[PDB]
Amino acid sequence: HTQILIVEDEQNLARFLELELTHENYNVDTEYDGQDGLDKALSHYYDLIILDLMLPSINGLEICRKIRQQQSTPIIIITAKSDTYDKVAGLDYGADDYIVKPFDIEELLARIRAILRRQ
Template sequence: MGNRILIVDDEWNMRNLIKIYLSREAFQLNEAKDGYEAIEMADQYAFDLVVLDVMLPDIDGWEVCSTIRKTSEIPILMLTARDDVKDRVLGLNIGADDYLIKPFAPEELVARVKALLRRRKKDNREIDKLLITFNDLSIDYDSRETWVKGTRVELTPKEFDILYTVAHNPKTVFTRDILLDKIWYSEEFRDLRAVDTHVKNLREKVRKAGLSFNPVKTVWGVGYKFNRPEDQY
């Protein structure tokens, strides 16, 4: 299924024109004819992008944008007939992602929509990389925090790095040498046995926190890999 887009404009002709442009790209398209309807639809349905006109009959597009931004980071492309820098700055400051001046070429509308969708997809991939969750275990790379059943587990920097490295690559077996190369600084004392010690301590801490599975598996004669909950038995 294609991306779902909400088109917000009080003029039927403009909504229809935008639909014609975007329907060629196999998007799923929904319409709202005023601001309140747009807010209600954005609250009820999961859209991938909003094309939002500034001039609406009830509340203006800026208020709609600001309201949506309180609960969602969905990309918003604002449309306006006024080529006023102050208007564009206002829209961007309250959360709009891009601006398009009417009248616009169909190719430019489609290109801007695709660019915003690509950016959102990339952002989502980055979030997925930074936050890893397996059952009751959550590993947040950005804050460098580990949580078990909602309780934070205090790990040393090396323990955290080992856990994140194997969890981020759950199908990869890491030798002790590779873990030393990835996690230890070149000027630090490097000892293969230190990896074993950190793994042992890591396992003990998450076990005491109530984790129902052992997250780091020993691959005998090789090293370590992530031990997913479904791989325990």
């Protein structure tokens, strides 16, 4: 059973993502703080981690780099706002995909599938 960690401080969006991913037979853990999210990722192996760029305590870009120092775990960054520099930084720091809002859940789910195929 595939395990996903969501690190998202916007509780409405965190809840939407959890519900939609659970409906696809994913087991989902959620953290609402950037440091709790980093701590959780480093203490348990997930199949894929979704990070919001804009997180409290430590932002998603910096969480991504710290995870990737220690693990090969797939990472997707999602964000409300971002230009090409932000995207390039996120992918260069270890993200496997980088998605700007608004996005349709069907695209997120397909990109998860595409990443997990190769694991």
